[PDB]
């Protein structure tokens, strides 16, 4: 009784902006806001439980830790407590990171200068 409208596939941020454009975005944002970390937060490509986030490109104050950031993203997605949520950077879960996001940036940032995160309702695919 419902009909599926097929739809174009979901494009990632790296698909939408070229590498050189991303590199310049970060160079500018780091000069203008040296205390903010430039983060790209995207839903895992095969995710079927969690909704899509309203935006993609974030500036996160450098002292914010991962437990704080998880709380912010769950709030932005308007999740209830019954809903699981995992935030992954480069193939590993950010739940138990102690450090501020400043240190995650230093360890994990892309070549382009963004820190990429993916969320999902499971930790491993």
From Swiss-Prot:
Query: What are the protein's GO molecular function terms?
Result: ceramide binding; microtubule binding; phosphatidylethanolamine binding; ubiquitin protein ligase binding
Q: How does it sit in the membrane?
A: Lipid-anchor
At the top level, the lineage of the source is Eukaryota
Coiled-coil regions listed in the entry = none
Mutation: residue 58 to A; reported impact is: Decreases C18 ceramide binding
Q: How is it modified after translation?
A: The precursor molecule is cleaved by ATG4 (ATG4A, ATG4B, ATG4C or ATG4D) to expose the glycine at the C-terminus and form the cytosolic form, LC3-I. The processed form is then activated by APG7L/ATG7, transferred to ATG3 and conjugated to phosphatidylethanolamine (PE) phospholipid to form the membrane-bound form, LC3-II. During non-canonical autophagy, the processed form is conjugated to phosphatidylserine (PS) phospholipid. ATG4 proteins also mediate the delipidation of PE-conjugated forms. (Microbial infection) The Legionella effector RavZ is a deconjugating enzyme that hydrolyzes the amide bond between the C-terminal glycine residue and an adjacent aromatic residue in ATG8 proteins conjugated to phosphatidylethanolamine (PE), producing an ATG8 protein that is resistant to reconjugation by the host machinery due to the cleavage of the reactive C-terminal glycine. RavZ is also able to mediate delipidation of ATG8 proteins conjugated to phosphatidylserine (PS).
Asked whether the keyword Lipoprotein is assigned, the reply is: yes
- Record's Gene3D superfamilies? Phosphatidylinositol 3-kinase Catalytic Subunit, Chain A, domain 1
The alphabetical list of record keywords is: Autophagy, Cytoplasm, Cytoplasmic vesicle, Cytoskeleton, Lipoprotein, Membrane, Microtubule, Mitochondrion, Phosphoprotein, Ubl conjugation, Ubl conjugation pathway
Location in or out of the cell: Cytoplasmic vesicle, Autophagosome membrane; Endomembrane system; Mitochondrion membrane; Cytoplasm, Cytoskeleton
Note the CDD domains from the entry.
Ubl_ATG8_MAP1LC3B
Summarize the impact of residue 74 to A: Impairs cleavage by ATG4B
Q: Name one GO cellular component term.
A: cytoplasmic vesicle
Changing residue 33 to A does what? Decreased interaction with Legionella effector RavZ
**Homology family:** Belongs to the ATG8 family.
User: What PANTHER family does the database record attribute to this sequence?
Assistant: MICROTUBULE-ASSOCIATED PROTEINS 1A/1B LIGHT CHAIN 3-RELATED
| Oligomeric and partner information | 3 different light chains, LC1 (a cleavage product of MAP1B), LC2 (a cleavage product of MAP1A) and LC3 (produced by one of the MAP1LC3 genes), can associate with the MAP1A or MAP1B heavy chains. Interacts at microtubules with CABP1 (via EF-hands 1 and 2) but not with calmodulin. Interacts with FYCO1 (via C-terminus). Interacts with TP53INP1 and TP53INP2. Interacts with TBC1D25. Directly interacts with SQSTM1; this interaction leads to MAP1LC3B recruitment to inclusion bodies containing polyubiquitinated protein aggregates and to inclusion body degradation by autophagy. (Microbial infection) Interacts with Hantaan hantavirus glycoprotein N; this interaction contributes to the virus-induced degradation of mitochondria by autophagy, which leads to degradation of host MAVS and inhibition of type I interferon (IFN) responses.
| Known function | Ubiquitin-like modifier involved in formation of autophagosomal vacuoles (autophagosomes). Plays a role in mitophagy which contributes to regulate mitochondrial quantity and quality by eliminating the mitochondria to a basal level to fulfill cellular energy requirements and preventing excess ROS production.
Q: Please give the name of this protein.
A: Microtubule-associated protein 1 light chain 3 beta
Species of origin reads: Homo sapiens (Human)
């Amino acid at each position: 009784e419902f009909v599926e409208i097929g739809g174009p596939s979901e494009k990632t941020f790296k698909q939408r902006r070229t590498f050189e454009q991303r590199v310049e975005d970060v160079r500018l944002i780091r000069e203008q806001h040296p205390t903010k970390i430039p983060v790209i937060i995207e839903r895992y490509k095969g995710e079927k439980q969690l909704p899509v986030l309203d935006k993609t490109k974030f500036l996160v104050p450098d002292h914010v830790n991962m437990s704080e950031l998880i709380k912010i993203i769950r709030r932005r997605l308007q999740l209830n407590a019954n809903q699981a949520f995992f935030l992954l950077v480069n193939g590993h879960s950010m739940v138990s990171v102690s450090t501020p996001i400043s240190e995650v940036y230093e360890s994990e940032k892309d070549e382009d200068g963004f820190l990429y995160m993916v969320y999902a309702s499971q930790e491993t695919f």
